[PDB]
Every structure is written in C-alpha cells, then in structure tokens.
Amino acid sequence: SKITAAPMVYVRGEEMTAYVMDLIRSRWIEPRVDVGGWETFDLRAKNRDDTEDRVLRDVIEAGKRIKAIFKEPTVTPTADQVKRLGLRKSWGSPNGAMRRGWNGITISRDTIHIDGVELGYKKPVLFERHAVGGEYSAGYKNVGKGKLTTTFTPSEGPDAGKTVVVDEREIVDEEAAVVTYHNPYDNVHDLARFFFGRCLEAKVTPYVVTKKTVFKWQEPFWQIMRTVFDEEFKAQFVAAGVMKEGEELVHLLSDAATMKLVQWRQGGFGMAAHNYDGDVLTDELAQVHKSPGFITSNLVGVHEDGTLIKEFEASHGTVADMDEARLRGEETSLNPLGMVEGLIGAMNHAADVHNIDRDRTHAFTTKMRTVIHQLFREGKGTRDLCGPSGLTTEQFIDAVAERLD
Amino acid sequence: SKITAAPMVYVRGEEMTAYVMDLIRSRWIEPRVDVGGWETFDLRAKNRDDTEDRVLRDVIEAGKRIKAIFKEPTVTPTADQVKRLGLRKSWGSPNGAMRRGWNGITISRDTIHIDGVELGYKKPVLFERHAVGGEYSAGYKNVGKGKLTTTFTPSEGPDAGKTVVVDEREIVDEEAAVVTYHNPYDNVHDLARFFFGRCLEAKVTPYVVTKKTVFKWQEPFWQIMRTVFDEEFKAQFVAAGVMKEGEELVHLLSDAATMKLVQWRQGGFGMAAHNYDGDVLTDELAQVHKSPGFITSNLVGVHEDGTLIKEFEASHGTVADMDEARLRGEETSLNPLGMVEGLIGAMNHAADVHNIDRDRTHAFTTKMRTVIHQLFREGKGTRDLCGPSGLTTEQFIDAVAERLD
Ligand SMILES: [Mg+2]
C-alpha cells in the first residue's frame, strides 16, 4: 500500500519552483504516498490579492492546528509586482504573520550538505536567527527638529502604574529618523534549549553572537543563553567530546562573527543571534557555502499547548529568469535540493507530531535524500554542481523517480 | 633642502607600534622632511592619566585647528590597565570625543594593497561607515510587562509645538529590551559628496548599502545619496568611463552586501552604509582582504570653514606580544604598512589642505610606498607576508631608509 501521509500544510507559490514541485509531487510523492492529509494553499501573489489575503490567514490557522508546514518560494506582492502581475493592491511579506501567528522562536539557517560533493563548509554549520523583535517591528517617523521622548509604564511588580522616562533627546537635524523597537527575551530560554540541544546532537561547538558590549540592552540574550548552557548542557558537551573541561561558552561580537564565517571553512560550529544580525550573517553564510539555496530557512515556533510548530522553506526565490527560459523552450536546470530538504523536514515533523505511518515516512524521506545524493555523486545532478554535462530540470526529476522504487 | 611638512597633528601611543614609528620618524622622515610644523602628543595610557587627560583635549583642539591628524594605535586606560600600568584611575575611549570634536561624518575603511603581492581583493575597495547615529547613541531600558510610548513634538512647520505619537506598544514579556535611537541625516549630503568624489578619483563603482526595504526610516540615506549622485556626479562618472550612459546608482540591501564582499574578489568598488552596518561589513572586508591591519580606519569631518578634517589610523593594536619579545631580546617582524599608509594619508592631507609643498610631499609619500612594495616583491618584506626568510622589524626599517634617497 501507499504511505499514509500525516496531516501537513502545503503552501504552493508560482513560476519555476511551482512547476518543479508539481512534477516532484506527481512523479516522486504521489505514486508512493497518499496525500489526502495534506491541506494545500495557493499563495500566488495574484491569489493573495484575489482573496484579500484570506489564503494567508487560512495558512496560519492550518499551521497552528497541524503543526507542520512546507512552503514553496513565493512572490511577495511588492509595488513592482502590482505593476507586472496586474494586482489591485500591494501586500507585505507573509513572514511577519507566520512569525507572530506561530509564536516564532528561531529561523534555523543551516548549511545543506551532499555526501560526496564538497561545498564551502566541510562540516555542517547550524545557525539560529531569533525569529522576533528588533528593527523588523520598529515604530518610526522621519522628522525635522524637535523633542523626542520615550516613556514606559510597567503593568506589574513594585512600580506598577508609575511612568518613567526611557529616553529624551532633542533632534537638531532638518532630516532625521526616529526609531523605537523592543526585543522580547522570554523565548530566548526556549531558543537556548533548542539551539544547544541541536548543537549537541550535531556535535558542533556553539557560539552566541551579539553587539552587547555597545548595545548594552542585548546583555540578557547572552546571559539567558550562558545560564541555560552552564546549567543544562556544558557537562554534556564535554562528554560528547565537543568542548574541553573548563572551556566556557564563547561570546562573539557580530563584528568578529562576520570574520569567523569567512575563516572557519572547516564548519562544525553553531551560532545564535538576534533577528537582524541573523538575517545578515546567514546570507554571508550562504555565500561562503555556495548560494542561498544551500542554506535552510526553517521557522520554529510553539503552540500554546507546547508542541513545536515547524515550517520549512527553501532560501532561494521562484527563479523567474529560468521559468521564462522554460516558456521559450530553452533547457533549464533547477536544483530542487533546497525545496526537497524542506519538504522532508515538514513530512518528518508531521509524521512525528501525529504518529501516522511514522516509520515508513522517515524511511521514504531518507530514501529520497539518499537517491538525490547518489545522483550528484554519479555526475547526474543539476548543472549548478555537475557542470554542463549535468542534467536538466526534467531529466533530474525523472532520474530520481526511476531510482525511487 | 628638506621638504617643508605642513602643519599636522601626530599622536603617539606605546609598546611595539610606538617603538616602530620612533624609528620611522628618526630614519625615514626627519632626515628628508622638516617637521617643525608637526604638533606631537604623547597618548600613552600613563600620559592620559599623568595629565588628568589634558593631553586628549590638547589633541582635539590641535586637530580642529590643523585639520590633519595621524594617530598611532593606542591603549585605552581601561580598569584592566590601571593595575598593570600603575595608573591613578581609568579613562574612557578617546574615540567619541575625537568624533564630536572634529565633526566626524565618516570612518573611511579602505583596502591596503602591495603592488605585486596578491591579497583578497585584486583592486582597491573603498568603504564609508557613516560616523553618527543609530544604536550607538540609543536610549534603552530592560523591562517587564507594560506600555511603551514614543512621542515627538516638532519645533518647526505648520504643526510646530503639537505632540504626536511615533510609536505605541504593549510589552508582554517578563524580560524585554526597549530601545529608542535617531539617525541624523543632514550630513549625508556631505558624506555623499565625499564618497562619490573619492570613488570617481579611484575610478570605482559606488554602491549604497541599507536595509531600507524593511527599515523604512533609512530611505533618506538612499534618497540623499542618489540625489547628490544624479545632480553632481553621474555625468562625471560617465565622462571618466567608470559608468556608462544610463547606468543608475545601485542600492544593495545590507544582507546582499555581505554576499558581495565575499563574491567580488576583483575589488574595484565602493560602498557607503549606516554606522552599525559599516562596523560589521568593514570587518568582513578585513577578513576577505587579509586581516584588520590591511584596512584603513580614517575619520573624516567637516570644519566650520568648509574644508575637511582628516585623521588617519591603522586598524591594529599596539602589538604588545612583539613588544614583550623585543624586551626579552627576541627577534620581531612588525609590518609597518598599515601605520605608514595612515601617516602618508595625514602628510598628504596636511600638504593639500594647507597648500604647502604639495608636489614634493606627494612625491615623497609615493616614494615610501614604492620602496616598501619593491622590498616585499624581492622577498625582503616582513615575515607576516615573506615567511621566516623575511626581514626583522629593524632590518626592514633600515632597508627602506637606504633606498629612499
Ligand atoms: Mg567592527
């Protein structure tokens, strides 16, 4: 019989990556898997506009309920896409809605590896980008001269109801930005446990990255991480052979971390950072490793009941330049590994959360990865890695289908 | 007849770098250049303490007057140095006082090259780090649950004197940072002119780097840059053959620029960014190129009279490990190029801003660089680049001196 897929959210996009995933689902998944449990959504930019973003709200509900989401690369309906695709209004990135809706802890941005193919980092690197806070949720104005004041009124504790001044300053420029944001740090306890748990299992040395020497409000990010590490993990990292006895958890300034990403070509490390530092440093990570497609973008949140909500995504876009070449009838070569890693992660997590056909699902997802890697080893991978004698998009997809059983 | 040095501020530090520059002043500069106009200051940590920091104030006043400063690496008299150096008390970093005193608008962070020795970037790269604003001067608090409010009362325009809300948010975490900052943008006009002028002279393509797509308050950094470019430079870039007719100034997202720094190993570009982004990106630049010592750290400010105050530094410390080796009688090999590039920059600026012996100064500073590079090509540079067969600190210094004429 076919494998019974556990409940999972599937978010379809458009252009080259949707064409490729249509093929993968029809030729790899569907012959071997009953996908009745998959709740599919059309997140075309046109469909987000056509539905007034009801589809995005349905995605968020489904994700809370099901706990496991695969999302394809999607076209954010920016002002430029309104012009091109002929939309009625512009819509922001869906990332904010997912990160708030699923109580986001981290975006895991890990290097993707192929056994037998050398990429930039020799051994796995793990990266946690704190999923919330910082300038991504700032309030701001662009102003001239005047008086800026920031007040805070606690709602509990000894000084509940008493307003204090956080900051007061005089703007003396005709043009200035004024900006306020917050970092919520309660979930850094969860982040730390998630990060250090991962790093231990991977046997990689963990590092915490901030600008806390100068941006002193970040100190709790470090302190929370170090406390969890010392109390709950340090002896375990010693016993795993990862760190020497007496070796303390290392703090890296963001300034240093940017240098270490270029230097540490052997890999075998983990970093955790705030939202913006994570955004920047993981794109650097992508470039050093190979390209955006070879780093994960795995959002990890938590339901109110304590079950982890995991969404998985490739880190490249929809690849319109290649899609246009397809409709002109020219040969394409899209590497589907990024998206497949995400689908694997989503299918695996769905199987674990719901305990539906768990053994057979892990065996099948493992088999997909193994077959993919073996083809790359054999010189039958896509042209990004195997050169001009590498396979086209369709040849690669058919090659895997023939190998799968 | 010696070259007449223009008025210049010389700030001496301590340890190995002061020892080296003492030899360079004695053996390269003084025999060939009348340094009567140099005002020299002793910025040993011990001397900041011994003068109750009058020496720092004297440096700042002289720099305002003279407009050209070379500063050696220095040891900030932190709490850690008090016991070690026998100080009465600790003293803060001088950098803020220098930046405010000299109306700093940018820290210029440029790659340093040796003709015939391959470093990371083949051709010069220029970087401007905006020297003001951002989280470096943020007000902040670490708080629990409560209401945060940011208001602004403009002092000009039709709504002058009326308070408006910039931001309002409810803090729902037991542990959170709340942060307010501003970006003064009036001086981006001056920064733009300086940046594009330098890029034109260098014949490199300029790029502006921000996160303005998400951090929308940054938009004016781009708008001011692009407006100055279009109105005052684009035609000249076309005339010089640096850019083609109809080629527009490019904006790079900060997380794209981190990838470009690894990718663009040919060099031959310039970037301008906000304070924090510059701080992080220029260290990445250091690591790609070679190490921090091969990138400049030159503060540039605008004098009230319209001319520029320029201060030049190397981006390494005082090299205490070599100083200790030196004092035990062991061989050393300090590469003085970073500091020499700084001194060259200061002497050239002094000659140019005061219009004193420009041709002879520029010829002499060019000669020092030409002699240095040739020695490295012969394998008679310092041991960092030339291996164990390279010259010692003193041998290298004497090798240059005998070739200067
Ligand atoms: Mg830095």
PDB file of C-alpha atoms in Angstrom, chain A residues 178-349:
ATOM      1  CA  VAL A 178      13.461  58.492  14.995  1.00  0.00           C
ATOM      2  CA  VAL A 179      13.019  54.799  15.891  1.00  0.00           C
ATOM      3  CA  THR A 180      11.700  52.689  18.766  1.00  0.00           C
ATOM      4  CA  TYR A 181      11.669  48.910  18.994  1.00  0.00           C
ATOM      5  CA  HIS A 182      11.672  46.128  21.529  1.00  0.00           C
ATOM      6  CA  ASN A 183      13.373  42.750  21.939  1.00  0.00           C
ATOM      7  CA  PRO A 184      11.131  40.170  23.648  1.00  0.00           C
ATOM      8  CA  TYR A 185      13.518  37.857  25.522  1.00  0.00           C
ATOM      9  CA  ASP A 186      11.262  35.354  27.361  1.00  0.00           C
ATOM     10  CA  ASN A 187      11.552  32.903  24.427  1.00  0.00           C
ATOM     11  CA  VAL A 188      15.367  33.092  24.423  1.00  0.00           C
ATOM     12  CA  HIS A 189      15.095  30.417  27.162  1.00  0.00           C
ATOM     13  CA  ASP A 190      13.401  28.168  24.554  1.00  0.00           C
ATOM     14  CA  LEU A 191      15.822  29.286  21.837  1.00  0.00           C
ATOM     15  CA  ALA A 192      18.797  28.361  24.025  1.00  0.00           C
ATOM     16  CA  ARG A 193      17.415  24.891  24.777  1.00  0.00           C
ATOM     17  CA  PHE A 194      16.540  24.325  21.117  1.00  0.00           C
ATOM     18  CA  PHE A 195      19.943  25.594  19.871  1.00  0.00           C
ATOM     19  CA  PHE A 196      22.113  23.786  22.404  1.00  0.00           C
ATOM     20  CA  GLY A 197      20.099  20.571  22.017  1.00  0.00           C
ATOM     21  CA  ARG A 198      20.705  20.720  18.226  1.00  0.00           C
ATOM     22  CA  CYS A 199      24.360  21.566  18.524  1.00  0.00           C
ATOM     23  CA  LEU A 200      24.949  18.689  20.988  1.00  0.00           C
ATOM     24  CA  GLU A 201      23.253  16.158  18.654  1.00  0.00           C
ATOM     25  CA  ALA A 202      25.265  17.536  15.720  1.00  0.00           C
ATOM     26  CA  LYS A 203      28.464  17.661  17.891  1.00  0.00           C
ATOM     27  CA  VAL A 204      29.229  21.235  16.881  1.00  0.00           C
ATOM     28  CA  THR A 205      30.706  23.983  19.036  1.00  0.00           C
ATOM     29  CA  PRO A 206      28.094  26.638  19.877  1.00  0.00           C
ATOM     30  CA  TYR A 207      28.660  30.428  19.850  1.00  0.00           C
ATOM     31  CA  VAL A 208      26.412  33.336  20.868  1.00  0.00           C
ATOM     32  CA  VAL A 209      26.718  36.453  18.690  1.00  0.00           C
ATOM     33  CA  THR A 210      25.636  39.981  19.718  1.00  0.00           C
ATOM     34  CA  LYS A 211      26.810  43.603  19.858  1.00  0.00           C
ATOM     35  CA  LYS A 212      26.221  43.686  23.662  1.00  0.00           C
ATOM     36  CA  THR A 213      29.464  45.490  24.561  1.00  0.00           C
ATOM     37  CA  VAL A 214      27.991  48.641  22.944  1.00  0.00           C
ATOM     38  CA  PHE A 215      24.265  47.786  22.521  1.00  0.00           C
ATOM     39  CA  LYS A 216      24.030  47.016  26.210  1.00  0.00           C
ATOM     40  CA  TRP A 217      20.304  46.173  26.199  1.00  0.00           C
ATOM     41  CA  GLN A 218      21.274  42.913  24.444  1.00  0.00           C
ATOM     42  CA  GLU A 219      23.066  41.596  27.569  1.00  0.00           C
ATOM     43  CA  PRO A 220      20.092  39.340  28.566  1.00  0.00           C
ATOM     44  CA  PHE A 221      20.354  37.494  25.214  1.00  0.00           C
ATOM     45  CA  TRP A 222      23.833  36.398  26.276  1.00  0.00           C
ATOM     46  CA  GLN A 223      23.024  35.897  29.977  1.00  0.00           C
ATOM     47  CA  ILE A 224      19.957  33.723  29.277  1.00  0.00           C
ATOM     48  CA  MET A 225      21.953  31.635  26.776  1.00  0.00           C
ATOM     49  CA  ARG A 226      25.002  31.229  29.085  1.00  0.00           C
ATOM     50  CA  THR A 227      22.838  30.305  32.109  1.00  0.00           C
ATOM     51  CA  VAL A 228      20.981  27.599  30.171  1.00  0.00           C
ATOM     52  CA  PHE A 229      24.269  26.366  28.725  1.00  0.00           C
ATOM     53  CA  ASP A 230      26.132  26.165  32.054  1.00  0.00           C
ATOM     54  CA  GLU A 231      23.215  24.646  33.975  1.00  0.00           C
ATOM     55  CA  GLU A 232      21.802  22.245  31.400  1.00  0.00           C
ATOM     56  CA  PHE A 233      24.354  21.467  28.659  1.00  0.00           C
ATOM     57  CA  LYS A 234      28.015  22.238  29.394  1.00  0.00           C
ATOM     58  CA  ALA A 235      28.920  18.880  31.009  1.00  0.00           C
ATOM     59  CA  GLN A 236      27.107  17.126  28.151  1.00  0.00           C
ATOM     60  CA  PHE A 237      29.155  18.976  25.511  1.00  0.00           C
ATOM     61  CA  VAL A 238      32.330  17.888  27.399  1.00  0.00           C
ATOM     62  CA  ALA A 239      31.180  14.259  27.493  1.00  0.00           C
ATOM     63  CA  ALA A 240      30.274  14.426  23.749  1.00  0.00           C
ATOM     64  CA  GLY A 241      33.883  15.412  23.007  1.00  0.00           C
ATOM     65  CA  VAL A 242      32.818  18.805  21.639  1.00  0.00           C
ATOM     66  CA  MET A 243      34.380  21.085  24.282  1.00  0.00           C
ATOM     67  CA  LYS A 244      37.188  20.651  26.799  1.00  0.00           C
ATOM     68  CA  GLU A 245      36.544  20.741  30.520  1.00  0.00           C
ATOM     69  CA  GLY A 246      36.857  24.348  31.697  1.00  0.00           C
ATOM     70  CA  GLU A 247      36.179  25.717  28.144  1.00  0.00           C
ATOM     71  CA  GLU A 248      33.481  28.365  28.657  1.00  0.00           C
ATOM     72  CA  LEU A 249      30.732  29.165  26.147  1.00  0.00           C
ATOM     73  CA  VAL A 250      32.156  31.804  23.795  1.00  0.00           C
ATOM     74  CA  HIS A 251      30.536  35.122  23.041  1.00  0.00           C
ATOM     75  CA  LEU A 252      31.369  36.621  19.618  1.00  0.00           C
ATOM     76  CA  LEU A 253      30.750  40.192  18.669  1.00  0.00           C
ATOM     77  CA  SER A 254      28.815  40.422  15.425  1.00  0.00           C
ATOM     78  CA  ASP A 255      31.970  42.166  14.097  1.00  0.00           C
ATOM     79  CA  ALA A 256      34.022  39.073  14.832  1.00  0.00           C
ATOM     80  CA  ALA A 257      31.376  36.545  13.757  1.00  0.00           C
ATOM     81  CA  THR A 258      31.384  38.084  10.270  1.00  0.00           C
ATOM     82  CA  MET A 259      35.125  37.333  10.088  1.00  0.00           C
ATOM     83  CA  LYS A 260      34.783  33.813  11.510  1.00  0.00           C
ATOM     84  CA  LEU A 261      32.232  32.856   8.811  1.00  0.00           C
ATOM     85  CA  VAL A 262      34.897  33.512   6.169  1.00  0.00           C
ATOM     86  CA  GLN A 263      37.701  31.917   8.218  1.00  0.00           C
ATOM     87  CA  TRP A 264      36.035  28.767   9.577  1.00  0.00           C
ATOM     88  CA  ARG A 265      35.841  26.824   6.298  1.00  0.00           C
ATOM     89  CA  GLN A 266      36.013  23.504   8.155  1.00  0.00           C
ATOM     90  CA  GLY A 267      32.474  24.162   9.505  1.00  0.00           C
ATOM     91  CA  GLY A 268      31.391  22.209  12.582  1.00  0.00           C
ATOM     92  CA  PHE A 269      30.048  25.163  14.578  1.00  0.00           C
ATOM     93  CA  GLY A 270      26.741  26.762  15.594  1.00  0.00           C
ATOM     94  CA  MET A 271      25.821  30.425  16.044  1.00  0.00           C
ATOM     95  CA  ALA A 272      22.795  32.087  17.615  1.00  0.00           C
ATOM     96  CA  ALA A 273      21.983  35.769  17.101  1.00  0.00           C
ATOM     97  CA  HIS A 274      19.290  38.447  17.216  1.00  0.00           C
ATOM     98  CA  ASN A 275      16.873  38.934  14.334  1.00  0.00           C
ATOM     99  CA  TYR A 276      18.837  41.405  12.186  1.00  0.00           C
ATOM    100  CA  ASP A 277      22.319  40.026  12.902  1.00  0.00           C
ATOM    101  CA  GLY A 278      20.929  36.610  11.947  1.00  0.00           C
ATOM    102  CA  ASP A 279      19.449  37.928   8.702  1.00  0.00           C
ATOM    103  CA  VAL A 280      22.784  39.465   7.639  1.00  0.00           C
ATOM    104  CA  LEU A 281      25.137  36.783   8.887  1.00  0.00           C
ATOM    105  CA  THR A 282      23.150  33.875   7.395  1.00  0.00           C
ATOM    106  CA  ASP A 283      23.276  35.470   3.943  1.00  0.00           C
ATOM    107  CA  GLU A 284      27.026  35.682   4.393  1.00  0.00           C
ATOM    108  CA  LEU A 285      26.910  32.019   5.417  1.00  0.00           C
ATOM    109  CA  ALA A 286      25.032  31.258   2.173  1.00  0.00           C
ATOM    110  CA  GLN A 287      27.659  32.930   0.006  1.00  0.00           C
ATOM    111  CA  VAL A 288      30.568  31.171   1.727  1.00  0.00           C
ATOM    112  CA  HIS A 289      28.832  27.772   1.491  1.00  0.00           C
ATOM    113  CA  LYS A 290      27.669  28.174  -2.157  1.00  0.00           C
ATOM    114  CA  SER A 291      24.473  30.182  -2.601  1.00  0.00           C
ATOM    115  CA  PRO A 292      21.131  30.884  -0.838  1.00  0.00           C
ATOM    116  CA  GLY A 293      19.667  27.548  -1.970  1.00  0.00           C
ATOM    117  CA  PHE A 294      22.183  25.583   0.140  1.00  0.00           C
ATOM    118  CA  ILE A 295      21.052  27.124   3.464  1.00  0.00           C
ATOM    119  CA  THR A 296      17.759  26.180   5.161  1.00  0.00           C
ATOM    120  CA  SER A 297      15.047  28.617   6.280  1.00  0.00           C
ATOM    121  CA  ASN A 298      13.229  26.632   8.918  1.00  0.00           C
ATOM    122  CA  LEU A 299      10.888  28.609  11.175  1.00  0.00           C
ATOM    123  CA  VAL A 300      10.365  27.044  14.577  1.00  0.00           C
ATOM    124  CA  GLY A 301       7.554  28.285  16.805  1.00  0.00           C
ATOM    125  CA  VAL A 302       5.469  26.850  19.616  1.00  0.00           C
ATOM    126  CA  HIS A 303       1.726  26.180  20.065  1.00  0.00           C
ATOM    127  CA  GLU A 304       0.109  27.257  23.342  1.00  0.00           C
ATOM    128  CA  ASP A 305      -0.025  23.508  24.281  1.00  0.00           C
ATOM    129  CA  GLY A 306       3.778  23.277  23.979  1.00  0.00           C
ATOM    130  CA  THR A 307       4.030  21.364  20.675  1.00  0.00           C
ATOM    131  CA  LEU A 308       6.652  22.831  18.337  1.00  0.00           C
ATOM    132  CA  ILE A 309       5.263  24.369  15.151  1.00  0.00           C
ATOM    133  CA  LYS A 310       7.752  23.835  12.314  1.00  0.00           C
ATOM    134  CA  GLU A 311       7.637  25.479   8.933  1.00  0.00           C
ATOM    135  CA  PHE A 312      10.199  24.640   6.284  1.00  0.00           C
ATOM    136  CA  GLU A 313      11.240  26.645   3.244  1.00  0.00           C
ATOM    137  CA  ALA A 314      13.955  26.806   0.653  1.00  0.00           C
ATOM    138  CA  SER A 315      16.035  30.020   0.764  1.00  0.00           C
ATOM    139  CA  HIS A 316      16.000  30.812  -2.977  1.00  0.00           C
ATOM    140  CA  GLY A 317      13.103  32.522  -4.779  1.00  0.00           C
ATOM    141  CA  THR A 318      10.755  31.324  -7.537  1.00  0.00           C
ATOM    142  CA  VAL A 319      13.515  31.626 -10.224  1.00  0.00           C
ATOM    143  CA  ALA A 320      11.579  33.642 -12.831  1.00  0.00           C
ATOM    144  CA  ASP A 321      14.644  34.016 -15.148  1.00  0.00           C
ATOM    145  CA  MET A 322      14.664  30.238 -15.551  1.00  0.00           C
ATOM    146  CA  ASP A 323      10.856  29.999 -15.824  1.00  0.00           C
ATOM    147  CA  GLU A 324      10.885  32.483 -18.697  1.00  0.00           C
ATOM    148  CA  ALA A 325      13.567  30.332 -20.412  1.00  0.00           C
ATOM    149  CA  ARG A 326      11.232  27.293 -19.989  1.00  0.00           C
ATOM    150  CA  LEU A 327       8.310  29.027 -21.746  1.00  0.00           C
ATOM    151  CA  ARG A 328      10.718  29.972 -24.568  1.00  0.00           C
ATOM    152  CA  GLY A 329      11.545  26.215 -24.814  1.00  0.00           C
ATOM    153  CA  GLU A 330      15.188  26.568 -23.690  1.00  0.00           C
ATOM    154  CA  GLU A 331      16.870  23.931 -21.473  1.00  0.00           C
ATOM    155  CA  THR A 332      16.641  24.659 -17.692  1.00  0.00           C
ATOM    156  CA  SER A 333      18.494  23.111 -14.696  1.00  0.00           C
ATOM    157  CA  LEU A 334      16.862  23.938 -11.335  1.00  0.00           C
ATOM    158  CA  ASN A 335      18.418  22.152  -8.336  1.00  0.00           C
ATOM    159  CA  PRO A 336      15.422  21.024  -6.225  1.00  0.00           C
ATOM    160  CA  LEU A 337      17.526  20.002  -3.164  1.00  0.00           C
ATOM    161  CA  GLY A 338      16.671  23.094  -1.088  1.00  0.00           C
ATOM    162  CA  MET A 339      12.939  22.631  -1.500  1.00  0.00           C
ATOM    163  CA  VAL A 340      13.167  18.823  -1.042  1.00  0.00           C
ATOM    164  CA  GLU A 341      15.080  19.264   2.265  1.00  0.00           C
ATOM    165  CA  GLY A 342      12.227  21.478   3.429  1.00  0.00           C
ATOM    166  CA  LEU A 343       9.549  19.023   2.303  1.00  0.00           C
ATOM    167  CA  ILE A 344      11.451  16.191   4.062  1.00  0.00           C
ATOM    168  CA  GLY A 345      11.583  18.243   7.257  1.00  0.00           C
ATOM    169  CA  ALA A 346       7.876  19.039   7.053  1.00  0.00           C
ATOM    170  CA  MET A 347       6.840  15.443   6.244  1.00  0.00           C
ATOM    171  CA  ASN A 348       9.087  14.120   9.057  1.00  0.00           C
ATOM    172  CA  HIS A 349       7.707  16.553  11.625  1.00  0.00           C
TER     173      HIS A 349
END
